A = this chain, B = another copy of it.
């Protein structure tokens, strides 16, 4: 991976981004900017490249007009036993935007409104194509030079609907994944909810040190997981006893058995954060609170649908 080098007898590499992603000009297209993702030659990462290629192709093929905010794969090739995915050029990820523009205290509610709509449109396309992303978070969301259009990236995470709790990013992990319940598109809707709170506050919604702490924090917001849901979980015994008490595990392990968790998480107070806002922004923050309340239902089946999300006051009013 060296600057000045040429890939596929056309891509002149002039920059790093941060597997490896480089910025290059296509000599065969009047030196138009591309991004090239070079995937490691090792056994696991190659088969993950094969999958990411197939998922992008299927999502690109299912959105020809590019209205549903997934990363555009231009083409692929091989350079010295290494798979290379050529992509539309893009500035940076929302993790970088939160640093530089958010200054670690989050973005303007207008920006979150716009980002919310685009991410909801991304879920719609993922559902249509029977795809779970499973690793949605600011780091896997790219933006253009002007920072107004986001594309969801990194589908090396991705799976078909029909297909474990340590696989992706703990903070954005849905409770049904943690307890080992059968899961659908709701896990991506959950991860989006976590992301929206983080885009406005700059902070992790559920900063749990373990899957156990994750369930505790989700229940600090919504109270104890419903018995009907706990029971459908293959890993219920790791978190709940035979009486369906929660086992709060602190790490040598100390365990506290709880009959109930009192809801204590004040989502509105954490979103506002003593800002003293004008009336128009205050209303949009209250509407984000309501949207989050509807997204972060512990039972997937009770979560706001993608269409109800796109129609939500926060995005529409």
Residues of A within 8 A of B (CB): 2-4, 6, 9, 12, 14, 25, 27, 29, 31, 46-47, 49-50, 53-54, 57-58, 60-62, 64-67, 74-78, 80-81, 83, 93, 95-96, 98-99, 104, 108, 110-111, 113-114, 128-130, 138-139, 144, 146, 148-149, 160, 162-163, 169, 171, 198, 202-204, 207, 209, 238, 241-243, 245, 247-249, 253-260, 279-280, 307-308, 311, 317
**Chain B residues within 8 Å of A14, by CB:** 76-78
Query: Whole-angstrom distance from the CB of A299 to the nearest CB of chain B?
Result: 14
Query: Whole-angstrom distance from the CB of A225 to the nearest CB of chain B?
Result: 16
**Chain B residues within 8 Å of A77, by CB:** 14
Chain A at the B interface: SS class: mixed
Are the C-beta atoms of A114 and B62 separated by less than 8 Å? yes
**Chain B residues within 8 Å of A114, by CB:** 57-58, 61-62
Among A14, A65, A146, A280, max chain B CB count under 10 A is at: A65
CA gap between A65 and B14 in the complex, in Å: 26
| 9 A–B contacts, CB within 8 A, in A order | A4-B46, A4-B53, A31-B81, A60-B110, A64-B111, A65-B160, A76-B317, A139-B245, A198-B257
Known: A58-B114, A169-B242. A258 touches B99 (CB 8 A): yes
Give the number of copies in the complex. Answer: 4
Residue from B57, B65, B108, B257 in contact with A163 in the complex, judged by beta carbons closer than 8 Å: B65
Are the C-beta atoms of A95 and B245 separated by less than 8 Å? yes
Query: Whole-angstrom distance from the CB of A275 to the nearest CB of chain B?
Result: 14
CA gap between A113 and B254 in the complex, in Å: 23
Are the C-beta atoms of A203 and B245 separated by less than 8 Å? no
Query: Whole-angstrom distance from the CB of A308 to the nearest CB of chain B?
Result: 7
**Chain B residues within 8 Å of A249, by CB:** 207
Are the C-beta atoms of B203 and A50 separated by less than 8 Å? no
Residue from B53, B129, B243 in contact with A3 in the complex, judged by beta carbons closer than 8 Å: B53
Known: A14-B77, A128-B148. A111 touches B61 (CB 8 A): yes
Are the C-beta atoms of A308 and B204 separated by less than 8 Å? no
CA gap between A58 and B146 in the complex, in Å: 14
CA gap between A146 and B96 in the complex, in Å: 34
| Chain B residue, CB-CB nearest to A92 | B259
CA gap between A110 and B177 in the complex, in Å: 34
Residue from B61, B65, B202 in contact with A162 in the complex, judged by beta carbons closer than 8 Å: B65
Residue from B9, B31, B81, B258 in contact with A80 in the complex, judged by beta carbons closer than 8 Å: B31
**Chain B residues within 8 Å of A279, by CB:** 29
Are the C-beta atoms of B130 and A149 separated by less than 8 Å? yes
Residue from B27, B75, B78 in contact with A25 in the complex, judged by beta carbons closer than 8 Å: B78
Query: Whole-angstrom distance from the CB of A86 to the nearest CB of chain B?
Result: 11
A-B contact sample (18 more), CB < 8 A, given A14-B76, A74-B280, A203-B255: A3-B53, A4-B83, A12-B81, A57-B114, A64-B110, A67-B160, A76-B317, A95-B259, A96-B259, A99-B259, A99-B260, A104-B248, A169-B241, A198-B257, A202-B256, A203-B254, A204-B247, A207-B253
